[PDB]
Design a binder for this molecule. Sequence first.
Ligand SMILES: Nc1ncnc2c1ncn2[C@@H]1O[C@H](COP(=O)(O)OP(=O)(O)O)[C@@H](O)[C@H]1O
Ligand SMILES: Nc1ncnc2c1ncn2[C@@H]1O[C@H](COP(=O)(O)OP(=O)(O)O)[C@@H](O)[C@H]1O
Ligand SMILES: Nc1ncnc2c1ncn2[C@@H]1O[C@H](COP(=O)(O)OP(=O)(O)O)[C@@H](O)[C@H]1O
Ligand SMILES: [Mg+2]
Ligand SMILES: [Mg+2]
Ligand SMILES: [Mg+2]
Lengths: 164, 164, 360, 360, 360
Amino acid sequence: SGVTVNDEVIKVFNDMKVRKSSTPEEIKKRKKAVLFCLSDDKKQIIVEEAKQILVGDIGDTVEDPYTAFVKLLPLNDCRYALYDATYETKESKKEDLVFIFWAPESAPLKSKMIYASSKDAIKKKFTGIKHEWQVNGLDDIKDRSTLGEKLGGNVVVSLEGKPL
Amino acid sequence: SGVTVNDEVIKVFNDMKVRKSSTPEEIKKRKKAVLFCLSDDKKQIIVEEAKQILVGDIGDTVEDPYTAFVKLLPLNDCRYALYDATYETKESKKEDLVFIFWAPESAPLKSKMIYASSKDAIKKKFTGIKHEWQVNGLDDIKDRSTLGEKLGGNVVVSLEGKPL
Amino acid sequence: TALVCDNGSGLVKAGFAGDDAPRAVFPSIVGRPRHKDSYVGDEAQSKRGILTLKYPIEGIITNWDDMEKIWHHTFYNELRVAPEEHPTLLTEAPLNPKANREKMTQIMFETFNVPAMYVAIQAVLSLYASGRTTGIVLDSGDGVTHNVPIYEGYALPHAIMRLDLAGRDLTDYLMKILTERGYSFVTTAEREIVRDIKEKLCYVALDFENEMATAASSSSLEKSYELPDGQVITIGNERFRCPETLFQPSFIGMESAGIHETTYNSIMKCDIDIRKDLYANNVMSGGTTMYPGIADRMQKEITALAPSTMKIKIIAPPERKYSVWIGGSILASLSTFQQMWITKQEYDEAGPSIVHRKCF
Amino acid sequence: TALVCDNGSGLVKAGFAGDDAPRAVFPSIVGRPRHKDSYVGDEAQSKRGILTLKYPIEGIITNWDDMEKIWHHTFYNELRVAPEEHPTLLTEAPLNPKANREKMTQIMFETFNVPAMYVAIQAVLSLYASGRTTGIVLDSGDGVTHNVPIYEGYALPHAIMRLDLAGRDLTDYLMKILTERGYSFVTTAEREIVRDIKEKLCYVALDFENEMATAASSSSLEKSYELPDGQVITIGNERFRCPETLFQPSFIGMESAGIHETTYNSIMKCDIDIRKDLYANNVMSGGTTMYPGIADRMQKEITALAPSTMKIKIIAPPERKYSVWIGGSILASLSTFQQMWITKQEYDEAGPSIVHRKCF
Amino acid sequence: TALVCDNGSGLVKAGFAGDDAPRAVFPSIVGRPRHKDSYVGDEAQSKRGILTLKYPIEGIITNWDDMEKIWHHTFYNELRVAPEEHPTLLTEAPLNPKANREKMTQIMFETFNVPAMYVAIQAVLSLYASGRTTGIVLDSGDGVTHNVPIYEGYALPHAIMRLDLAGRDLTDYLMKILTERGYSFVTTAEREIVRDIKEKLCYVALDFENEMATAASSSSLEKSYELPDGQVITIGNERFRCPETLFQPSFIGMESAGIHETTYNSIMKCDIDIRKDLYANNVMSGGTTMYPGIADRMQKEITALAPSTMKIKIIAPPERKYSVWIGGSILASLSTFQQMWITKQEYDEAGPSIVHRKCF
Ligand SMILES: Nc1ncnc2c1ncn2[C@@H]1O[C@H](COP(=O)(O)OP(=O)(O)O)[C@@H](O)[C@H]1O
Ligand SMILES: Nc1ncnc2c1ncn2[C@@H]1O[C@H](COP(=O)(O)OP(=O)(O)O)[C@@H](O)[C@H]1O
Ligand SMILES: Nc1ncnc2c1ncn2[C@@H]1O[C@H](COP(=O)(O)OP(=O)(O)O)[C@@H](O)[C@H]1O
Ligand SMILES: [Mg+2]
Ligand SMILES: [Mg+2]
Ligand SMILES: [Mg+2]
């Protein structure tokens, strides 16, 4: 139903889904969180230019990789996002990546309709992504416990190094 | 709205609704049809004295238990009645008992009003009676097929041993 | 004389032993008002807009305070005989737990004060009344559908399949596909009329694609039904689209196997040496196997699953609607059955534990 | 440029794609004289004492000789553009049969000669225009009320509830409870005035007993309306007694569940793992969810039914009256939607069967 | 760095060597639609009503076109590292045929292009991680239950018992005995919930008759579980009636010996001089030995079979669920293990025959 995804998006997804042997410099240039947006004439999903969190910027400029991800998202417009989560369950220590469909209630209808019909066109190209999470209100994403609610519910015990 | 039912009526109803182990003499003294009337001062529903059909009088003095029931009813006055019907449906052979509210169009209004307001006071005391049938004109009760019309409509195939 | 009270999933069948058909056939419903205390059977089906309807046998007895109402309505208001002077046979579903078989015996002796009773299995009496002691019994009732494989008079409990698709979910699907035409059936009294359209005008398609492609061009298919107020509704290709739900349960949205594959997965779960005497002896029963063309469709669909050297035979007797009841009316009217029963003295000297010993 | 013609149950909404609101809003009525041959839309609402009024979409299209009239009146007399030069999006109700979706495509290409068309679902466009792809959509129109649960952009067809209580039966109840005061509204032109009292002065009571007990003593409640001839009628406690019929259908005499319980029995009919993302995403639409205080009453009544650990959230967007139309005006004014449409050449090489393939 | 991919019967455990627990735990399922081409692991467990589920390790690898899918899903979508830059340890079941051990080595070097690999035995790594080299290993997984007697680091192949009763057949029995209460679990997503009731609330009865006679009168036993939609189901005496199937397989209808008698008939099949150092060193592992009270029941039931002068001891380590994986994560993170591996150059100069020589 309309929009196609650009090939620069799929290259950013293949830098996150399959990691590979890396120097200590290059493993600090992998992406912990990425925002995907729409182009000016609204025909293609593109990687947004200066809204991303690198793995190497955690513990210095970014104190916490989740509290500094909620601040990227605009409150009057819609986005896709892609977050590489680090969580420990009761028996196992895991690491999976989460597809976030951000569409706040304060956004205009021409930016809420055009991503809801284009979501299936960018999910199909993202092979093997398990955790979908649509988010509308700020209050549903702002807290740390509401990510661990989608990921395991009651079996998560430590999300991004901090206990729940 | 007025009249109560006498306790000699409820004893006659419990002799018909639940039958029990009987000698061949006593099973010929169960009641196939009973008429209930009003007392002289019109305060109580009583069992009418000599208008009833016994099961033991069928096939001898009473040739047919339904044609000899229509002849009991008075054409210028109103009655309740209580008829133990014997009917075979398409798949099953049944036996249930029918409450008849007889109120002809030729009766006076002081005998038509006083049973219509007292019907709910004698139906409530008759637990589990399924087939209510108000009758006004003679032509609606006289035929055999108009009892089988209330009982099953088109699924009755033999009423009182005779085919329809 | 003996009473035979079949504890149906959606219809209590009850009558006196030695009769060909049950005297009383009424729904397994106890209705209570939203805001007399409780209405039972046909009374709760007649009243409208004021009752909430509950089922105590929705095939295993769930509520024993509601089941006592159902049986009190059977003996007094429908059979019309006192229970303390008549011995009372009862029936239980396959895979009924051992505690539920003792509570069924305690109610008859302590509440209703029966002189004697007996409890039989609903699948075994269906197979004995088709002249067999070995054969797989498809018992498709109102609320539950069982496949019970029986070898030499004993049902194999690990192999008994249970499907929760049954004839009640075909009524509530026939109210949806007749809403497509425009007949807005929605009330409780307009559910009984849809259930009477289902008996008289439905049939199972021999092949669904070639029947539904014939349903567009042909005029033979289309029937006309007459409602209780004399209006005439015209049913078309909803005649075979309704009982085809039993063979494709994806129509009613569940992922379960059809009745031609829960039958096959109950023969394959039995021991290897006895499967050939279950393939050649499929026996059907219950109200929902009464459709015409269902013995011809079960043979076709099981043959397409089963290996090619096995003989697939479906036996449909013509009185299979009441075969569980008729088998209990013959067996309790035998003169040599009189020492088989559990008497009230045997309850007083052994409690509810007697039922396992003598009603095995 | 593209036409978006929403096939409403009681109001045809139609306009050009890219506009914020429909150009044409008119009733779904074809009127014929009792003894010009047929009057359509506002003409049959204006004439009095001489016409018999018929509805072809009384939510599923019943009469295709009357529906061709409705659409001929939309393109020429109300939109005011020729249909052969403009592509025409259309909408269909949930649970629309497959034969009715082909006849809707055959009329556009053979009668009106459209260059291209598309057919969408009315519940899905309501959910996409609230920024969601998963959520239960309460679509309460004039003639029908649907609950459509949608999980990942696909409506679950076995779980779609349909209630036949809707905003048209609230107009014909408001003419009864204003007859209690003494305002004898009875004509066809006095039904439109009652329908305009309903929009401007009705509201849903938060608790009916404490509002109706306050309605006896308080003077805040009582409003004054001014009729087309300048007379002043005074409405009292008929402001909240009218839309309370949606929550208690026993007022209008039917036994059906209210809109706070057909919503609950549509979440409970969905699979066990996805019910928590339907409880927290109830989305409303249609003209009859426009009452103030109905998002605050739906949250209270569903919370009293639902288990206590589930988060019940009702989302009411402020333009929910036309959200099915606005969602089809954005989606057909996209420049990248131009290859999505069904062209006239694709009809000529595949017949009406094309609609299932490209308008899924 | 090294990958350790345990080829589980019902759960693939996979992680990086040196971690305490596996990163990826997902089912051994490849699902295909009835009528993307194939869904693997958690995707085929999530989808409903449309897939047919197949297992390639239903403990010996049956289908190599489905097993390549499982391993492609482990490296890329769950571990998240490319296989050509990481050496890959694998595990095989006891009594794995010699041709299946060569095809497992050919896929890693020719399809996935690993730089090095190694294949170990699942029973030997369980015994070494309990600080022993001699002892009988009860490895009770999802799909198969093995008793492997090991004397001085070498499993005795004629004495290895295999029981086909395992933890998967306890899930499909717990859906039957909770159907007795009335909780009609039947769908694929309602099988995972029953499998999570089994982990958290089941336990092995110390004596079955005195526990089940206490279960009628006592209120301590009865627990309450909360479903994904917040409904509360109450489980009673189905807590100990489920894992008692392992000690009495006649409950699930098979004639096989229990796990306290396949253990005994594996010690009696070993040589006469070494049986005393197997009686005193029973070691357990796998997911299905995690029940509380099963080390106290295995000691009681083996002591009743074994002669009276022998010391019967059951060793249950607390992390025995993943002991086959943890033993392969220690052994592949050793710095002195770096010349043990089979390199890609050794495959190019000796074909698949290398695996017998270096992975003995
Ligand atoms: N001729 C028929 N065709 C199809 N269904 C029928 C027919 N007669 C009865 N039924 C159905 O069979 C069901 C009752 O069967 P029954 O065996 O008595 O069920 P149960 O014992 O589970 O109460 C009802 O759903 C009824 O509508
Ligand atoms: N503000 C309002 N308050 C209450 N009902 C309203 C309001 N505005 C419109 N309606 C009603 O909504 C109905 C029309 O809604 P609509 O969604 O267009 O229906 P349909 O699509 O079924 O034709 C009419 O019954 C109308 O009276
Ligand atoms: N705490 C537990 N209690 C009982 N069974 C458990 C427990 N945890 C896991 N299981 C079961 O163990 C099985 C998985 O064990 P596993 O050793 O991984 O099997 P496999 O290697 O054969 O795939 C599953 O049937 C699972 O339900
Ligand atoms: Mg039955
Ligand atoms: Mg609408
Ligand atoms: Mg294992």
